[PDB]
Amino acid sequence: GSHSMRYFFTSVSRPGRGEPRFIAVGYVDDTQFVRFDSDAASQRMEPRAPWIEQEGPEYWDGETRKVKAHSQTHRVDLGTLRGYYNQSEAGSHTVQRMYGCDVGSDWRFLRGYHQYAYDGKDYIALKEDLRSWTAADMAAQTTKHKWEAAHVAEQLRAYLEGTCVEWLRRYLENGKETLQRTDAPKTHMTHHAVSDHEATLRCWALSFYPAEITLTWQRDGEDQTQDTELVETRPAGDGTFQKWAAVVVPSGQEQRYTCHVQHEGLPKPLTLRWE
């Protein structure tokens, strides 16, 4: 199956409360394995998975320096971007960075990512060819020109295609008991009366990994999409995920509504019915 590694960096400025808040987290497809918080009691990269802990002290001493370097740049980027948009230091602002790589089922490189955001909107992003950038406005083009001279696109392409991928494979092998295992969802339905002539069929899916899943309600084969309550895939707190879909079925028609569940852990897509 396909995999991916992605790191997430959030820097929120505190005007009167001192240095900006910096949070860094790293994932493997849905599994957080590292964290860093500038306000945490530990100023080192802390592990969140058992398979990342088998790395020697040289790994953590290195990843601590790198994550401290990201915080220093975001601390500077906050002031730089504040000047680009001629903004006052009277308020707080948000700088978010995300980068990583995707691999296909053959574990070959599939796509690379490197993106910035300022105050919740896209600021600059590395394009698919891993050679050019996308600059939103003049402030972003200033950054684009600065990164072109520094040869930043070339450094990422060597990392996204060569290091992000190679170390993803190392993480997969070290956590094959966890990351390469697929836990199929446990499906069930619930029936609840809402009126004298209407009822609520809620199609459930719990304890599955990864979080990619698809819940669909059909009526006589037609996809019920406009009238179908769907909730965002939520975490359970132990590593698995949950999701449910609901439709308001008139009394007596429950027999012609069908729920469809698609997931990587299912050999064939499930078709659930009431009665």
Partner: peptide
């Protein structure tokens, strides 16, 4: 593994 090359905006 993180990206080593420092990047500024």
């Amino acid at each position: 593994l993180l990206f080593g090359y420092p990047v500024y905006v």
